[PDB]
Amino acid sequence: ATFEIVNRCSYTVWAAASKGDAALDAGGRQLNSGESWTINVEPGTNGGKIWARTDCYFDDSGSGICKTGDCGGLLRCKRFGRPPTTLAEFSLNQYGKDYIDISNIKGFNVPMNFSPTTRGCRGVRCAADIVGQCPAKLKAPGGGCNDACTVFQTSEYCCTTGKCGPTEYSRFFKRLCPDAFSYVLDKPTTVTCPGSSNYRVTFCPT
């Protein structure tokens, strides 16, 4: 599958793509304002994620740090990023279908649209000013809006037992972005697409 990753933000982002124990394609790249990066994701990829990283500093070997979404200090991500990260999530060619969603379960840093570029399904978007509106206790001093599990580490926020409900904090994300997951057991907002669809992830879509 092809993913076109497009930065419409006025600021540079460092895109990242991983399935948690491996990079997808090159794993990461700088995207200046307006730039597009096309990656190839292996068919059958289960639990893939794409995100933006902000305020990164890398040396000549691709080692450094990002203020949001850092993946063990690498330009080319092999692992998932440090919250807060708005997440484009996908599992491809799962019994003949693709499954896509946006998640705020690991917080929010950059607004994003995640849409198919091929026929047969719809896209999802979380484009509200979640950082600007972020509850005081969730504001990441490094930048972005943390999820409550990251901040408070409770069974209720982290859904440790598999029995959690919505919270004041999850309802904040849900109110601003109804089409993204706000907590682990949220009513699913997953879109079913034809197997082997292609996609575009757009940062700052509005």
Curated annotation (Swiss-Prot):
Disulfide bond residue pairs: 9-204, 56-66, 71-77, 121-193, 126-177, 134-145, 149-158, 159-164
Alphabetized UniProt keyword annotations: Cytoplasmic vesicle, Disulfide bond, Signal, Taste-modifying protein
InterPro entries the UniProt entry points to: Osmotin/thaumatin-like_sf (IPR037176), Thaumatin (IPR001938), Thaumatin_CS (IPR017949)
Record's keyword annotation contains Signal: yes
Subcellular compartments: Cytoplasmic vesicle
Cellular component aspect of the GO annotation: cytoplasmic vesicle
TM stretches of this protein: none
Family: Belongs to the thaumatin family.
Function of the protein: Taste-modifying protein; intensely sweet-tasting. It is 100000 times sweeter than sucrose on a molar basis.
Name by which UniProt lists this protein: Thaumatin I
Species for this entry: Thaumatococcus daniellii (Katemfe)
